[PDB]
Design a protein around this ligand. Structure first.
Ligand code: SF4
Ligand code: SF4
Ligand code: SF4
Ligand code: FES
Ligand code: ZN
Lengths: 125, 57, 47, 68, 82, 693, 123, 117
């Protein structure tokens, strides 16, 4: 199922496959934009490490880091491919299943439906 | 050659922290921070260039 | 200095790599294009 | 070479034809501050000391006790 | 137990049916029998019926409740409580 | 039923009556737009979405053209492209040249679609110049630069329809049409922060976040909000060591695409008043100290105090995660104590609704269940404050179908018409035996909403008894296809606490503790702590709880650790750490594990996977994430917990009061935020900026 | 033409495990034989028995790898390393990477249980 | 003048070098570190160093605050900050400022203040 340690032929540090957890997901539809072009690929990136994520240099005020994977992120065409890759490397992962908008029928004419009782609210346009 | 930040004739800075310079820099030399100045202007509170990363492009 | 030789150590950066690829476009940029296939290499349509 | 005033530095490099003293008033920068020329101070106590212009990102709590 | 009992069981599973019955019928009887113990029933689809008892100073014990009858569930529980 | 049509040669099948743009979206064809949005009424004023349909002579608005059988749609005709260019040309004519200074820049739809569909250059060079627009002050949360408004009316549509705040609207006519209030009035609603996301251009912008970053330099992390108990899904944008902003991400079964203003703007409380080093009280002052020194001081206080059994009390606050609660409860049990209390009033005693079955303290109808409601009775609860997005959900349900809402409890300002049946338990008896009880009996999908504020009353037994009797009688309220009984928690951690049995024992409530351990626990008063008690505080911000302590330990905040939170639905959700804890702060369950080792009761787990294993041991539904499964014990639970043991309780004559006095400041984080402080004093009822008349 | 260099072996993936173990043992013998040459070349402080011990540990690390292709790759990389060492292509700096234990004690505090790891934020 | 350090010892700094700028005493942005704090945190690197040589440029906030308000007839003031003497485009992008509201309205790029009269 999962490649153990020390028969990975990549040469990466053992710590990568021992005490690091990656996460696989699809990017969420950004709330700020209506475009959806970034949401189809399956990203893979590493969960952060507490001590080594980022600190502030005491000279010019920069963001120092000891985590060599903080900037790395792979793109895959499909969830199964990402799973296969992570398994072949021996990475512990978690899958975050995507959420989608539930379909509902929208009619422009619905803005002008006659109301037989009291108006619940004044639509304004 | 070396870098310098300019002013308007009135002496107000010209940099408005738009951070395009930060985004284009091929050596990632530039580090910028910003926030609303007390008079409401959009200005930088930190603008660093690492002259040992810069490629003077 | 203690060992008098060039030693290898885990990576530690003074400034961390800032990946600005997060700002990729949210709109498909180019589209489908057009096909330049010669007519002698496209399957025929019946009738 | 750092002691050459700016503007003369450009003239001496064949940047411009007309020397700074011969340039019209229109093509002179307007300044709202006093102009001061300072050469390269490296190797002296006047060398530039860099620093972070921002206070720390996260501000710690000022401890205060209350009585039960 | 003295202090805590926990019931794990599937909602739709067939192997949990005696557990569902034991809970549904004698959960009140069990509670009144042990008025100081705290009883929890927690359900999830993939899990196999198990029970956990917590006696004192954090000591806990568990038995599997893959059982045929509501009776047999009851004696498994009683054997845990002892 | 579902009808058929062709879009750009493809074959797409869609429900009849849907808009053409829904069909295009389903068929994988991209259509530009501005004014259209999935959660808002259809407007059709931007004219960006034009397409050609063979029947129509002229191009048609895709967001508002209903689909019909056999329709043929082309989104790629030369006429369509020329149309998009023309529309963009006209859109940008008066748009200000503000991109370097606009906060939207880099994530602006006007930019992206001008770049994708507009012309490379412009034709408008008029010596008279462009139009300009006054700026309008609508409160301390949403900064306005109205030159950039493209008049999409998303802000108006949302403020009117979704949040029920009708002060926003469009005044004037033609070129001088201005979005605003026509006079100085705040956009006063707890959902106001969402017009920031809805406005496609930078006209409406986050004010506390203004000018602080650009989208391309932000690290985006998907996590879980903990301000309320709804469990909204959010995206945390951070650069380096500090968190910049919080924006919603879609989860159609929890918050839809919205979050309330507290969840959005209390992020600024995470970078001030923080706890960074252990503190030890010496005299009347705290002194900084090392982790070893702190923990050894706790151990020495434990050996000197010598607590027996329930003399070691543990209190859990509104914000803590499940793993930390589990650690704390296990350690306290291993000390021989059962005094694992919650922070709420009367939290020294066990809750009146019981703990045995989950359906006793959850939103048994899912949050999505509100969509089906035909009648709702609110008992001692104000959802507008306790769960804002759920209030919006109830509002949407009420607008689009007939629905009867009545409430018992304080007179509440609601976004929907409610019937007030009284402020008292006697009024509840009258109602449940009266006309609204009859309405519930007849209803097809009824649901009864009980506030968590009632559980905190001493007479909670009487209310739970009355409600349980009514439920056990009426089959519509509780049958095998629909559970209408619902408890609405307000704190993100109450559901998880009840799930693990973080409930005091009967004999524990009698004892007077000699040592108290506050985990969060910032609702504590002077009264609930004995003077002689040795108090340990563990948290992330400096608040009253830390003021009460003898030793303070810094713990991580919800943005700095990957924890489990259980919302009102009983849904178990996992968060992700955006940044690392500041200073010398630590992960909470690690803190508990280490202190337990100093106490000689060393916990059996020292690794996150072992923590998840212990969680699976406590309950199997903590490890199943994003899953809701109904209870098979619906009928048993009501009888065994609500009507059974609550017979003896005597109802008081005290009227029901509001659970939370101030919506904006309810937590340590929220009380540490300058923005919430400013918002609270800006959005006060007695301020004319928030009146209308 | 471009001819191979000293101690170069053409890349060949063994079709059978046994034919691979023959080569593997040959390579191990070559490493053991070369140990004194390595000790002379790289001016090491430590002893030849320690070189040989290190080699044995390196060969031990993959003693239970099953799939044949992975064994082929490991053998090829091991030979590339041997050729790198024996031809003095490597310098002392890269050679001593193999030998992290013979450097002195790095400090007083190398945490082992949860409390010492926790005190240093490495728990 | 006298800043106490984290050590508990005293650091003496001339008054002129505690000012944030030659023309302004106090900070002009919440996140901006004051000179007092700069010295308190970096005093090791400031030893035996001559402060009068350090850059100390003028604070532009006051310089723009000294510029008089421009009065305009209509409802919109147009500003581009151009240099009428030199060639090319040397200003900032041309924007239009609405002045119907009471008081002065600042150019978003250059800070020049306009008012309707
Ligand atoms: S942030 Fe950079 S690009 Fe933008 S105005 Fe300032 S110096 Fe120029
Ligand atoms: S709203 Fe968009 S197009 Fe307009 S100035 Fe801002 S970033 Fe540019
Ligand atoms: S302010 Fe934004 S959302 Fe409102 S009309 Fe203008 S562009 Fe549309
Ligand atoms: S999106 Fe259809 S006309 Fe605006
Ligand atoms: Zn200007």
């Amino acid at each position: 199922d999962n490649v153990p340690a020390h028969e990975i032929v990549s040469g990466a540090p053992a710590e990568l496959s021992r005490n690091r957890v990656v996460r696989i997901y699809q990017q969420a539809k950004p709330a700020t934009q209506s475009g959806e072009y970034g949401t189809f690929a399956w990203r893979l990136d590493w969960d952060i490490v507490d001590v080594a994520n980022r600190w502030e240099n005491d000279l010019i005020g920069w963001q120092s880091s000891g985590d060599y994977m903080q900037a790395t992120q792979m793109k895959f065409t499909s969830k199964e491919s990402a799973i296969k890759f992570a398994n072949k490397q021996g990475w512990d992962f978690y899958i975050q299943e995507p959420h989608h908008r539930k379909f509902r029928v929208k009619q422009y004419a619905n803005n002008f439906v006659h109301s037989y009782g009291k108006l619940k609210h004044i639509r304004t346009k | 050659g070396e870098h310098a930040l300019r002013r308007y004739p009135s002496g107000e800075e010209r940099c408005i922290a738009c951070k395009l310079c930060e985004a284009i820099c091929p050596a990632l030399a530039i580090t910028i921070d910003a926030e609303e100045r007390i008079d409401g202007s959009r200005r930088t509170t930190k603008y660093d260039i690492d002259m040992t990363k810069c490629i003077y492009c | 200095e203690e060992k008098r030789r060039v030693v290898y150590e885990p990576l530690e950066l003074t400034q961390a790599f800032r990946n600005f690829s997060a700002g990729s476009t949210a709109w498909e940029p180019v589209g489908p294009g057009r096909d330049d296939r010669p007519d002698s290499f496209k399957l025929p349509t019946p009738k | 070479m750092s002691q050459v005033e700016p503007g003369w530095h450009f003239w001496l490099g064949y940047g411009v034809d007309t020397a700074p003293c011969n340039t019209p008033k229109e093509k002179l920068p307007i300044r709202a501050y006093p102009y001061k020329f300072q050469p390269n101070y490296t190797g002296t106590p006047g060398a530039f000391v860099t620093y972070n212009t921002l206070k720390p990102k996260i501000s710690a709590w000022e401890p205060v006790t209350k009585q039960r | 137990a003295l202090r805590e009992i926990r019931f794990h069981l599937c909602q739709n599973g067939s192997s949990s049916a005696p557990l569902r019955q034991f809970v549904k019928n004698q959960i009140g009887a069990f509670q009144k029998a042990n008025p100081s113990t705290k009883v929890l029933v927690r359900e999830a689809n993939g899990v196999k019926p198990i029970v956990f008892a917590r006696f004192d100073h954090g000591h806990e014990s568990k038995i599997g409740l893959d059982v045929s009858s509501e009776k047999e569930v009851a004696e498994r529980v009683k054997s845990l409580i002892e | 039923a579902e009808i058929e049509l062709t879009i750009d040669g493809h074959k797409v099948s869609i429900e009849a009556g849907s808009a053409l743009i829904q069909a295009c979206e389903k068929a994988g064809v991209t259509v530009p737009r501005y004014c259209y949005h999935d959660k808002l009424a259809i407007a059709g004023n931007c004219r960006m979405c034009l397409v050609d349909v063979e029947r129509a002579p002229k191009p048609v608005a895709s967001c508002a053209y209903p689909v019909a059988p056999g329709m043929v749609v082309r989104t790629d005709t030369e006429r369509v492209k020329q149309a998009r260019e023309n529309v963009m040309e006209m859109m940008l004519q008066n748009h200000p040249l503000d991109c370097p200074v606009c906060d939207q820049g880099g994530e602006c739809d006007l930019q992206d679609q001008s770049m994708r569909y507009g012309r490379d250059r412009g034709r408008f060079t008029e010596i008279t110049g462009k139009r300009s627009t006054e700026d309008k002050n609508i409160g301390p949360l949403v900064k306005t630069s109205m030159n950039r408004c493209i008049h999409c009316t998303r802000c108006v549509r949302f403020a009117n329809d979704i949040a029920g705040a009708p002060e926003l609207g469009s005044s004037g006519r033609g070129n001088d049409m201005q979005i605003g209030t026509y006079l100085e009035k705040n956009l006063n609603t707890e959902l106001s922060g969402n017009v920031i996301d809805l406005c496609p251009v930078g006209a409406l912008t986050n004010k506390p976040y203004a000018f602080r970053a650009r989208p391309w330099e932000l690290k985006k992390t998907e996590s879980i909000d903990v301000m309320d108990a709804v469990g909204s899904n959010i995206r945390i944008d951070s650069k380096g060591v500090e968190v910049m902003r919080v924006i919603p991400r879609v989860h159609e079964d929890v918050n839809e695409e919205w979050i309330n203003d507290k969840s959005r703007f209390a992020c600024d409380g995470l970078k001030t008043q923080r706890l960074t080093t252990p503190l030890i009280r010496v005299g009347d002052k705290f002194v900084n100290a090392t982790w070893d020194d702190a923990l050894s001081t706790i151990a020495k206080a434990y050996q000197q105090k010598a607590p027996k059994g329930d003399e070691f009390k543990a209190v859990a606050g509104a914000l803590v995660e499940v793993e930390s609660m589990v650690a704390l409860k296990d350690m306290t049990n291993a000390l021989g104590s059962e005094n694992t209390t919650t922070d709420t009033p009367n939290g020294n005693s066990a809750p009146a609704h019981g703990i045995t079955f989950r359906s006793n303290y959850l939103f048994n109808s899912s949050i999505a269940g509100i969509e089906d409601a035909d009648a709702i009775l609110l008992v001692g609860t104000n959802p507008r404050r306790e769960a804002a997005v759920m209030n919006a959900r109830i509002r949407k349900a009420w607008l689009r179908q007939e629905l009867e809402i009545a409430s018992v409890g304080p007179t509440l300002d609601a976004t929907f018409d409610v019937a007030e049946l009284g402020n008292t338990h006697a009024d509840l008896e009258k109602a449940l035996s009266g006309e609204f009880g009859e309405v519930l009996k007849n209803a097809k999908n009824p649901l009864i909403i009980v506030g968590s504020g009632i559980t905190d009353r001493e007479d909670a037994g009487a209310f739970f008894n009355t409600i349980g009797k009514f439920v056990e009688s009426t089959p519509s309220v509780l049958n095998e296809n629909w559970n209408g009984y619902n408890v609405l928690q307000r704190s993100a951690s109450r559901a998880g606490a009840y799930d693990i049995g973080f409930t005091p024992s009967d004999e524990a409530s009698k004892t007077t503790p000699k040592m108290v351990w506050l985990l969060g626990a910032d609702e504590v008063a002077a009264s609930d702590i004995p003077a002689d008690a040795f108090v340990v505080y563990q948290g992330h911000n400096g608040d009253v709880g830390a003021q009460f302590a003898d030793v303070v330990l810094p713990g991580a905040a919800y943005t700095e650790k990957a924890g489990t939170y259980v919302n009102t639905e009983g849904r178990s959700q996992i968060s992700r750490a955006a940044t690392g804890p500041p200073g010398g702060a630590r992960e909470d369950w690690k803190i508990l594990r280490a202190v337990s080792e100093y106490l000689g009761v060393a916990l059996p787990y020292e690794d996150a996977y072992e923590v998840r294993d212990r969680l699976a041991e406590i309950s199997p539904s903590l490890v199943r994430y994003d899953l809701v499964e109904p209870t098979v014990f619906g009928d048993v639970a009501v009888q065994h917990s609500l009507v059974g043991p609550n017979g003896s309780v005597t109802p008081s004559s005290a009227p029901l009061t509001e659970t939370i006095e101030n919506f904006y400041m309810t937590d340590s984080i929220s009380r540490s935020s300058p923005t919430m402080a400013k918002s609270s004093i800006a959005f006060n009822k007695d301020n004319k900026k928030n009146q209308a008349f | 033409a471009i001819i191979a260099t000293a101690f170069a072996e053409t890349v060949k993936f063994s079709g059978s495990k046994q034919e691979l173990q023959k080569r593997t043992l040959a390579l191990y013998r070559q490493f053991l034989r070369g140990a004194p040459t390595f000790a002379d070349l790289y001016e090491v402080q430590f002893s030849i028995p320690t070189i040989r011990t290190k080699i044995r540990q390196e060969f031990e690390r993959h003693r239970f790898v099953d799939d044949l292709s992975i064994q082929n790759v490991l053998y090829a990389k091991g030979h590339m390393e041997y050729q790198e060492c024996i031809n003095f292509w490597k310098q002392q700096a890269q050679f001593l990477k193999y030998f992290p234990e013979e450097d002195d004690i790095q400090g007083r505090h190398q945490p082992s249980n949860f409390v010492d790891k926790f005190l240093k934020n490495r728990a | 003048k006298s800043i106490i350090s984290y050590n508990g010892n005293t650091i003496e700094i001339p008054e002129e070098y505690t000012k944030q700028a030659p023309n302004r005493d106090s900070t002009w942005a919440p996140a901006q570190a004051s000179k007092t704090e700069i010295y308190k945190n970096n005093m090791v690197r400031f030893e035996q160093k001559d402060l009068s040589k350090q850059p100390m440029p003028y604070a532009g906030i006051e310089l723009i605050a000294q510029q008089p308000v421009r009065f305009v007839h209509g409802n919109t003031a147009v500003c581009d900050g151009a240099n009428h003497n030199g060639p090319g485009a040397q200003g900032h992008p041309k924007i239009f400022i609405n002045v119907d509201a009471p008081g002065s309205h600042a150019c978003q790029y250059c800070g020049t203040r306009y008012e309707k009269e």
